[PDB]
Design a protein around this ligand. Sequence first.
Ligand SMILES: [Cl-]
Ligand SMILES: [Cl-]
Ligand SMILES: [Cl-]
Ligand SMILES: [Mg+2]
Ligand SMILES: [Mg+2]
Lengths: 204, 243, 250, 195, 195, 244, 5, 5, 231, 221, 241
Amino acid sequence: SDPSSINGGIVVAMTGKDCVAIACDLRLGSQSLGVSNKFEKIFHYGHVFLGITGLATDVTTLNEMFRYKTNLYKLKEERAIEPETFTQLVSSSLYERRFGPYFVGPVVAGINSKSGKPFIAGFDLIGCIDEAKDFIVSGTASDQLFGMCESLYEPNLEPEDLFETISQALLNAADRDALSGWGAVVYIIKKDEVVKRYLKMRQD
Amino acid sequence: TGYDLSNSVFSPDGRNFQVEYAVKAVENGTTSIGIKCNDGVVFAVEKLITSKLLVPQKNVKIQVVDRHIGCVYSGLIPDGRHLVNRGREEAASFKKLYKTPIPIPAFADRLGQYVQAHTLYNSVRPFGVSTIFGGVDKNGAHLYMLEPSGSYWGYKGAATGKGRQSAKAELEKLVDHHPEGLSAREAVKQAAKIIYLAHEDNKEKDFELEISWCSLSETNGLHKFVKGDLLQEAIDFAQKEIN
Amino acid sequence: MTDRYSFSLTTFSPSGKLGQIDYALTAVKQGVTSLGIKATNGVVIATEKKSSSPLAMSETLSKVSLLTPDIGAVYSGMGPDYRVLVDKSRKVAHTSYKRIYGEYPPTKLLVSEVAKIMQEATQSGGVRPFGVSLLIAGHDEFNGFSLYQVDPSGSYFPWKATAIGKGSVAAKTFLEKRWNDELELEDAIHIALLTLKESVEGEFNGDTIELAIIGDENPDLLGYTGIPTDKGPRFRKLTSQEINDRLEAL
Amino acid sequence: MDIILGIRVQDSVILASSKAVTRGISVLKDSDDKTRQLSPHTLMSFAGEAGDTVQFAEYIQANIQLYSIREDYELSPQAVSSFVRQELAKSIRSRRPYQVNVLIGGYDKKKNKPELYQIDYLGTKVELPYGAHGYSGFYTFSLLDHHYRPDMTTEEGLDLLKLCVQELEKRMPMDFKGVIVKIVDKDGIRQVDDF
Amino acid sequence: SIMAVTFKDGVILGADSRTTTGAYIANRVTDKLTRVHDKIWCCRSGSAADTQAIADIVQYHLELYTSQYGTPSTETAASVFKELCYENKDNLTAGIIVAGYDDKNKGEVYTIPLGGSVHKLPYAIAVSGSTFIYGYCDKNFRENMSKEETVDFIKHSLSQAIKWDGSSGGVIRMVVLTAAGVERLIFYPDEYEQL
Amino acid sequence: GSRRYDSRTTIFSPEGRLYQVEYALESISHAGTAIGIMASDGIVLAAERKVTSTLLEQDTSTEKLYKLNDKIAVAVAGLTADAEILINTARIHAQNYLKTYNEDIPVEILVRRLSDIKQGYTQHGGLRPFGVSFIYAGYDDRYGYQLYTSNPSGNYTGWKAISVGANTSAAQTLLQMDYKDDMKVDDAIELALKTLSKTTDSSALTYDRLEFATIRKGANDGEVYQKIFKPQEIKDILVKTGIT
Amino acid sequence: XFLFX
Amino acid sequence: XFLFX
Amino acid sequence: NNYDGDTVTFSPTGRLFQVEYALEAIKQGSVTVGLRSNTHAVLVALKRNADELSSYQKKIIKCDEHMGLSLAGLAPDARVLSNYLRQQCNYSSLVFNRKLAVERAGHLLCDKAQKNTQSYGGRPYGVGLLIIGYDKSGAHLLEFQPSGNVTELYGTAIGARSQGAKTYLERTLDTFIKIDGNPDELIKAGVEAISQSLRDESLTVDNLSIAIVGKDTPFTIYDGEAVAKYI
Amino acid sequence: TIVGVKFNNGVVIAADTRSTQGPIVADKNCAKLHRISPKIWCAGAGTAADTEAVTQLIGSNIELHSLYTSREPRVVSALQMLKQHLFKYQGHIGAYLIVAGVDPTGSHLFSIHAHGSTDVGYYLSLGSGSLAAMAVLESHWKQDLTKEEAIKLASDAIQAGIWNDLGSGSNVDVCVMEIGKDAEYLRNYLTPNVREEKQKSYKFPRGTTAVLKESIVNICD
Amino acid sequence: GYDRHITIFSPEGRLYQVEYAFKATNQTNINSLAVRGKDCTVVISQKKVPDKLLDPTTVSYIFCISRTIGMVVNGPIPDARNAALRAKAEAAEFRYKYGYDMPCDVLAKRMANLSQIYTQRAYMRPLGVILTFVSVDEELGPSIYKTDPAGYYVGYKATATGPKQQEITTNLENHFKKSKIDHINEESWEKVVEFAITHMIDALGTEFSKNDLEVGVATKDKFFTLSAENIEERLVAIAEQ
Ligand SMILES: [Cl-]
Ligand SMILES: [Cl-]
Ligand SMILES: [Cl-]
Ligand SMILES: [Mg+2]
Ligand SMILES: [Mg+2]
């Protein structure tokens, strides 16, 4: 009866040279029982990418909510929302439910379309912002991911190299967590192109 | 025009005609007076005996607020009762929070603000009463008179109703002839006389006199009605003065 | 007791006119002249300070108001109606934007919110329309410099340059002749002072004229250092002295 | 309210739902139909807390039937599942939440594709080739992981379900008094009369 | 440890300066003597948060009272304190001593203990987290005492409390309320310890 | 009391008309003309700006044509301020539907709800109705390309080609004359402009006095693009059709 | 915890 | 979890 | 004229016309008499019928064991005010184990009527009431008017041609006031009083309505064959 | 670890830069110094979301108050507004703040606890490192400190927290608010915990990770 | 013409109910004057007690809003007291919420915003009063801010209100043209009161006894009204010069 560790799953985000990467596992479970191996935890609103771990009903609900809010943003502002602004919106929306919170660990990734600056951010369930140059981690194997990232990561990696680093960070973390795995997706995000790769990993 | 059809509407003069119309109802009412004395206040009122069938002494018009404030009014009697009911709520809520019984100036503004509120909206009618009230507090004796506009001042003597101009004239003489002050027992006798003199402007029906008083010495700072020997002594004094 | 007026005081006449909006615009017409000019590198808004009495201190009454660090507003019409609209405008910039996105709203969207408040006074129960027209000058990263007019109806239009109030018809003609798309900010201030001299009858100096600009960021007005991204407010109110300096070379 | 299974084959969706209703140490009924037709090409099976199940099912049925009349149009299975999920997602932070788990089997007439949706009481929605709720999954998921082929026919799908029901009858402690099986295809909803 | 004593010229309020979280002294120079009106002051014991919130509201009520009805009595101040303490007794843990000077009534002391009751006393002492002592050296206190005698009486009493207790400590603060005005006194440990 | 100052905005005339609705329609008839034309392969929205000034910023202006979602736009005729209240409501209703069903709102459902809000203001509340007529141009996977209009009464109807605002009588006769069912978007563009050019109260129809938008399937393979025309793009299409 | 003579 | 000097 | 649209508007002479029109409803109402001694208080009412096929409108309502009233004017308004009195009598019993004083009953009716003469939207009550009771200070008779004016009296009458019965009671005052410990004789004086307000029609068995309360007499209403004695 | 130190012509506040989830360091360089107003700054300890949210809300209301009154905001206004808000929520909003600033009245230093109690001091410390910080403040604080002395004392008090408290670490942030001057915010004033060079580079040979599928994501309209 | 009965626009863009509220201002036939010293702000008002039965101590149009702010009203006493009670409530609430004494100009703005609402909302009538707020502000120093039924407010070097306002205004205007400064260059408040009274006498052309005047004085950290004896001492000083 701990909302954050019923369904399980992980998200990790990393910055490189003129690029960002965000990755997630594909597992949705009911405690010990694996239910779905196609549960993607990464969504995008224009060029801003949002990963969400935690209670799956809240992951789905918050995706539907931020699509709603970013759609209205674009209609009124007449432009796509930027990562920095979207981060503040996630923070606002979570702290609005301060005493009845969404049981989620969201991660923002994207490149500012004006400045071209790579941006990543993480949040707790009540919307405290963790802004980081290097990497952000979330989910049931966050400890495992912190270990992998802190040793594997180096600054200013090229897209092709950054892909290998974040992939190895996720795969080896997920393999040491019972409630994570069952497939993985990696988004490599450059200024004006985004590649999405599905990783081959052990299905146990 | 039509500026007089709705309450809270300013005329081009800058007047609220509906409030001035309420005053006409007050001028139509029976005479009521207040006399401030050395250590307290005296209230008196004219009760018109419409019929033999009225029970003497058992249609009391003067009302008490808390234990230390007397209230008398001329005009629409029910409007006076409504205002006193509000006065009792205000006096209760003051005593509840601040412990001390409500000072008279404090109480005066509570009625003042409430009456004034009934001149701010067209959804309400102004009060059809002038209210003479007062009593004894920590700072001594206070007498006030409050009008349909919400206007009130402190008074040495106050009068309102059909015989106000007669009563005012007789009150002005007392102020001039007693600059060092009037005693409580004297003010009761004078109150009786002034009501009898003011009854000349309402002499078709005969009347019944009613007096009350608050005095630091005579009533121990509380509001009491003048009854029995002291009432009959005041009536006799008034009967002797008209003849 | 209670507000029994839950019905519209502004209704359509048989001709299709909304009387109270038309009458509100008449009140704006009686109002003192105010204008706005948009340059390539800034925006200027200006108005006369019609002083009720010479004993009055015209500094205390501010006809040109900061709404956000990068947005300013001036008016023609009923001053009190303007003062409460500025209060509501500053609050709505926070409640409906800054407390959500962590940044100040762009000019067009704050204008949109002010317009909404003025439209509600046109349809809601037991209220008359606002008897003011606003000129709102502002800057934002993605739209750059912009100038908007807002009317009692709640309608708003973007302007290269315009004027509202007493001598607006004549003032607008003067601006049409002088305005081009290559104007620098100093040139627009010069034209604003020329335009306003026509509509002002009495004394014309830095004490009877109120003028503000949306221009470059002002680090000196920020009040703190240490955050490179925070470069300070683009809204600056010109001083009595700064205006008099530009009236000599006129 | 124990066993609800679902298999999506090539051209149809098959729902199997246990017939027993038990309260205490007594089986009150052995013929209970734990399913409501939401629209002509969309069926919902349900299991959970007594009363809540039927109350929730009938409420959803009424709302979809209302949409059908208003728009003279059949809502897609994806749309019906999204509506149902949102109702459960409201429920979980209510004063008293609906403790109901549902499978939604539908045929999308626009895509000409069968669709099976699994939604738990929290509003956790997932699209699957086959699914289950409760302890049934613990036996049936591994079995279906082995014998399920995506291009299977309705007859193959029914034989695969028989294997699931036979495994449940052998290893499950409680007697669920068999299953009512319903097929959802392009021609609508029909019940397999003998299983 | 807080106390208020009525003497010939007025009334003296005294207290310690120690605020505790568990065994940690959060503030060793706390000002426990609080102004609610020019010559109406209170001693605060119990929750620091609760006593501050109450004192701030009482100050607002007396400021508003003064605007409308002029200077309020010490009894009036005590009544406002009691009303807040009594009506919110369930959610509050505040023990307050109210001391005030009137030219009519001279020095008055009212105690509002944890109950939310009001008691008018010649002097009041609360120690060990709002525990009011009856008796407390009744032979040591006389009526119409001198200012120096009162200061000496409170200084000794608080010194003994600080000596036995660990909740109380730091400097001894006193406020003297008289017709003359308001005087603030401070006694450092080296003076009061050798008593 | 307050009864004296109540206009009673929601009552019937002896003839059984709604005074405030009739007077609101009179208001709208003085507003700049808006034309919608529905073709087999898209929809055209054309609108005339109300007597433009030379110093009005044309390029960063929105008076007539508003976006509701990616698949639905409206042309406004009446009080702009009133329209914006209703437009924000419609934009929210669309996102509420998308949130609930994970499908773009069908055009008619959005139109019906916006029309039902207008209706409410004529039957209860004692407020003035919205002085606005809309032309809804939209696409959904059920009925394809659709044109609707709503007016202050809350009544809405479907159209192949329609005008609202000023000179609708004249505009509707010209559209009824030249419109045919197998028409292309490029043909519908030419019809819209030619119609405004003849009905306009201005001396000559110019780019600066026009707002223009198309809903096409011009994007790659089974997807709808909303093109809100820029000033320079209106200038070009106005020369190409040979009006200037 | 909270602060509290 | 929450972030907490 | 212009100042009678509602109860929130004074006339230029300071009159409330809506209240005066409410007072007019009472004059149209059927006559009812009230009188009392020191021991007993009596209500006599002339009930009115629609026609010979109809029943006679009941005029007298019991409020408690020691208090009740007779009505003249809008009967539904009498029902509202009598229901309010029942609740105030009942509140006094339940909370204070105390029979409500007839004087306090008057004060409560006055204050309820007043609120309906100062607020927009509402209307004044269109009924007059005669309240009789026996409390701790003996027998009582009250006259209520929807202006809010309540008056304590030895005797009175309200309704059409009430002036006749009111004149008789004014003459008889000294006689009927001393009818102590004799119910029948006090009723006889009430019946002879209401007889002074009759024109053409006389008192019949199903026409007359009498009520009495006193020292050792609960508030009881006599109708039909029970009032045959007093014809 | 957050501290406030009063000096001759102003007040200085300092803080560490460590954010934690249980025993894990979530952020090695987070900013605990908040601008309520240009010359009123806040140091926050406790629930990270609560301190940020409560600082931004009061900061917003103070900005609106400043515009309405046409005056530079006062620290007592920020203090009063914060304590009343925190009291209302009975400690459920876990924000422990050190509020310092310069205004027309002068220079002020306050602390607020989550339950809504406030204190006044010349030197204050809050958070898990408060006892380590207070030990230094009690040892080295004197009356009539200079600005240079006050910065050194504040940074030394934070250092005590960084080294001796497991809850505190990384760098030191200082904000100096002097009367008649712009508040100067010294982000990463000290950086005494720089990660040493890694022994090895864990850069992988390209193609090391097994890939099932590739696709181009469309982020354009 | 119901556009003259409630606060809606007339065809010529006017609010008649606001204009008529201004005329109610002079119903009392009382003239007020406010001036600033170096350290103080002085406000003087005519005191007329026509009835002999009145207690003259209770007849006042000067109110102590806060302990630093004073407010003189030109208009009927019911509306005056309505404004006074509200200003007292607003000043107290401000101190509680924001932890410092409400400034004179901020209270003025707040009361002006309340006045503005009455001109826009139909169910509320405007108050027929002009409120003159005086204090020695801790930021701005000696301050005069005046509110009217239109919701207008502004600061003043000096000001006058009432029937013969224009005569007092031009008298003060002419003095400040001569002195070439924004205040009365005088150390003691006693001499600033003597100036205020002297210039009112010269403007109105009437002499004053101790009971014909009412005086309010704002110093740093208190506003107080003078007694009849305090005024009498002040009138003697003027006469002996
Ligand atoms: Cl404390
Ligand atoms: Cl006062
Ligand atoms: Cl305000
Ligand atoms: Mg694993
Ligand atoms: Mg009004």
